[PDB]
Amino acid sequence: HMELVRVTEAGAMAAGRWVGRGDKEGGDGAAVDAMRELVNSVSMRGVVVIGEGEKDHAPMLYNGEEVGNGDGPECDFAVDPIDGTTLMSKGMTNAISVLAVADRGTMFDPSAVFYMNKIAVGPDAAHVLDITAPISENIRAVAKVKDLSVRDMTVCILDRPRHAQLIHDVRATGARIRLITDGDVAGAISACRPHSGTDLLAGIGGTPEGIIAAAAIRCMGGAIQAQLAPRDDAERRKALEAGYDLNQVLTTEDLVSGENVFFCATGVTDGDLLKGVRYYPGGCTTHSIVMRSKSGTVRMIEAYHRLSKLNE
Amino acid sequence: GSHMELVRVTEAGAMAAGRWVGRGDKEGGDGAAVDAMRELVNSVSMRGVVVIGEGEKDHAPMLYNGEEVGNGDGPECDFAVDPIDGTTLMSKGMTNAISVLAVADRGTMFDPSAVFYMNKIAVGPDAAHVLDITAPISENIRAVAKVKDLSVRDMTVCILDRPRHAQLIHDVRATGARIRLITDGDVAGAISACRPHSGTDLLAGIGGTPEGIIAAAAIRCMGGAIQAQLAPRDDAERRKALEAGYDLNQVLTTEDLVSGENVFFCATGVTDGDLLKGVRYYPGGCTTHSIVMRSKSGTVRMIEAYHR
Amino acid sequence: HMELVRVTEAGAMAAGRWVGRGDKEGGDGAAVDAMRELVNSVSMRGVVVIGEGEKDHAPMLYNGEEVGNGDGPECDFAVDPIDGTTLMSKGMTNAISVLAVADRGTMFDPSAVFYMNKIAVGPDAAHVLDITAPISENIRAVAKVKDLSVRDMTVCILDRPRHAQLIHDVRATGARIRLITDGDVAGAISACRPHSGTDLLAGIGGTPEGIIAAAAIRCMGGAIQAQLAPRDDAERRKALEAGYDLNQVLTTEDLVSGENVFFCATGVTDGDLLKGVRYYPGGCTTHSIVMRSKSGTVRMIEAYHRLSKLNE
Amino acid sequence: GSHMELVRVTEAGAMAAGRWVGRGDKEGGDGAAVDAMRELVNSVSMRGVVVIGEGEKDHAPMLYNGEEVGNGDGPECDFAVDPIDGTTLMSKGMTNAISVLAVADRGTMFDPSAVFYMNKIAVGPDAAHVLDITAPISENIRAVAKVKDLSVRDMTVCILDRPRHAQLIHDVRATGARIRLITDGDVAGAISACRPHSGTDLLAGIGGTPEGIIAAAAIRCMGGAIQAQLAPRDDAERRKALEAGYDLNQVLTTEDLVSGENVFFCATGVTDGDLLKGVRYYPGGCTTHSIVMRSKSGTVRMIEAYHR
């Protein structure tokens, strides 16, 4: 329901007061607290599948917690109160507050392994992706299915040392790189939205971000492919002991299946799709995206919040 | 406590109205819009009565004054619908056709057929405190202009183009202000007056009483002020109103027109206007542009929807 | 040169003060006077080919007059200080102030006959037009070359009694009609601009408006076809005696030939492409289009004019 | 007296810079931008000298400090070019790369290598009258906020992300304001400060002296104020400036930085920024987004160009 946008609107507005203030935990707490107060007010019966972590040293929106007013069917609840906490704390671009809802039990287990390799593309080339192939074959494939020259392709990649080869290969095909410092989820949405200046998202990031990204892709169209990415053999055992086929190419629908999927986001700082919170004498504005798998409707929502009296 | 889902009602009205723009068929557009809006309001979870609508039930089968509408009996509230504000504009492909819905606590909407027309003045939040419909239009113009920090000749006054407004136009012209004459679209006019960088600084003139009420709902949520006084047609109507309880000397404020504490208003562009883009079609679906506002919070939402 | 936009900017700003004020001549004089003062200041050597009329009871920008600072090659000069004077006087939409420049002698004679039948289309169907055929065959042709359904075609037509059959035919094909009360020139630009919601302009209007429309079409792309339209047999003699082949289908390049063509316009009231003049405490804004045949570059220009002191 | 044709210089810079965004090649983008800008300025009809440019002529072949540029010797004027403000941002595909040109009466531009860095503060027209670079940053914040009618915690202060600004950041944070840290882009930062609904209420910190001069040109035309004081690196430079004629205690105003009566400034988006969209390509050509302003008239033009 469109009401869920008020959850990310509250998370963005709380985080807005911490933009640039060098306090990551201050910003997270504000957003987490505003989001939970407002989510326990929406007509919804939810369990936190993706959130701040497990119960002990994450006392709010911990994985397992119940959320919503009490009524409604039960459903999976994923929340990233600030995707890009460090971006927020330093006043840098592309921080967003993020929520996704899906049928109960239909979200992948975010704790399987911390990281996953991802590639994502918009709808027109949703069926030519292969994460097992080198990035060049994916670039060339997508550039052909989209009929563009390869020097006009843009690949969004997190700027990390572990990506030195991924970055070199993309350049060596002549395509371009949009280097982001954080925001896997925003990066995927960018690759999937019509003519955004970004054709492909590629690289290794977090397993929760990948699941949250898949929920949006289930709504706006396109495809993500993923494989788990153990950080060492210790985690690789833990992943195998738990019963994961570490060679499976996980698809959008593996990460979030289920008939009904909701995604919405609101900008914290100015970014690639959403403007961040802006302040005025009377109040503030927020910029939000809201989407739904069943209809496929996508709404862009600009909201003025008068934090004051009428007619001042 | 938010009810953004009511945007679906004007979104449906406008998507129906939109397959009729530019076809010369005023009633075909109205009819389709009323259809889709009736289907959709009876699927939102709040029971209300249609207080302002398509006339009454002997020759308006749908959205007639008094119809029970909505799905689950939540709280009862007033419903005012204008399936196309700008039906002629819609038929001829012209700008500023919008589809409008208003909802307020049950009983709190003024009576729409007490008198058919009422004289109006309306201005936005920044100059609402100088309004005086009993003063001449020149004094409102100069007062509004001073507050707004504009010369009188920078001012732009929106007036309906009707024979009845010949003296009003003369007196507005005599002051030095510009005029924006509209053929119809009384609601969108008043909303323009209350938006900042819109081009309309003031709305004035005699329009319909339902449109005045719908306008007041909007203003309740976004800020500003409209003042009105009933303007009976002839001698029968002036009797009908005096022996109804109304002081004809009375200035009606926004809150007299819509007095509820919970007012909601939304509108969706049919054709391109100075506030909302019109519905645009392409193969996969269409896009609508809407405004949704709530008086309790004072929150105003611009909603651009891509339907698939 | 982009400097020419200041001519239409001045014409719009002068007319702005007459919007809605019920005085057609007041508005025309203001615009005519502001345009001429500013055109005699641009690096240009011009002769007024299309203007306010002949020398006697049109004392400013009369057909024949010299314009510009004195320097430069000589060139044809067309000016419509307010296209839609009645729209301006009543505060109605779509009034614009209009200027076109072309090689000297390369503009059609605007006095041949008062009126002309016109049809105009954007570039993608610029080669399937035929003004001699019924409107239906032109609609269907354009709808096929554009691959759209015919019920999705929109035809812009002046609302005049002399168009009762043109309007009936367009409806009878199921296409839509954008009924305008004035603004031939704006209507053509609308039909020729990419995705404007207007596919075709059709009908009889003024010969100067048709020539001014062709100058823009020489710049932004597309096609106009025209034939002169005598209002009676008296004018038909005058047109024949002067040596016109009243059956010629005049083309864009017949109306304005010449290697170099300039067009620009600025909104007076709010319209289909340009916003009208808007007033603020410090000043005003104008909205303008400027285009050039040789480059094909089209510029949209928003200008804030501070009619005051700096930093107030 | 208008010279809108100078937009072609940054339009060419940005169209060259744009075929390099997202390629990791900072110098390949710079080089292409300098190329096209040199070609184009030597084809506009006003002779000037490059006063601010790509360094000096032994290892900057083009746009070196002192180069005669322009076509026909009109009046002689000062030329300041920044072919890409945001070269690193351009190489990495990030926002806010712009291509910049500034021109003023000959001799009226401050000397760019008197000192390399200068401390800066800048704000827009509405609060320019409270600026005081000699006061602490907290007092400017609260003063600017009062004028702007904002709480201190609504304020947003743009600061370069450099080790040298650790105390500045601490003192800005200590007041309650938000910060917008930028990695580079000193010019675009200051222009943001002077635009209304931009998100940046104040710019502060030590940046380069050329960028400060280019910024003052902009401000001369659009309104607002920048204040600066020279900030010599070490002991050699502080001598170089004292025995050059400069009072180190001196507050420099906008007009001290650019003193001409005729200043022009234009900029074109390279990548998307908070003021200008970046160059976008398609098959037939491309589109650029530019700002052109002139101090004599105070006219500001947003120019969206479709090149074929």
Numbering used by the authors:
A (entry chain A), C (entry chain A): 0 to 311
B (entry chain B), D (entry chain B): -2 to 305
Wording from the paper:
Mtb fructose-1,6-bisphosphatase (MtFBPaseII), the enzyme encoded by the glpX gene, is the third component of the glpFKX operon involved in the growth of Mtb using glycerol as the sole carbon source. The MtFBPaseII monomer is a compact, globular protein with two distinct α/β-type domains (I and II) arranged in an alternating multilayer fashion to form an α/β/α/β/α-fold five-layer sandwich.
This observation may suggest that the binding of substrate/product could alter the inter-subunit association of the 222 tetramer. This passage consists of Pro193 from chain A (Pro193A), His194A from one chain and the rings of two successive tyrosine residues (Tyr279B and Tyr303B) from the symmetry-related chain. Weak inhibition (IC50 of ∼2 mM) of MtFBPaseII by citrate was experimentally confirmed after assaying a panel of di/tricarboxylic acids.
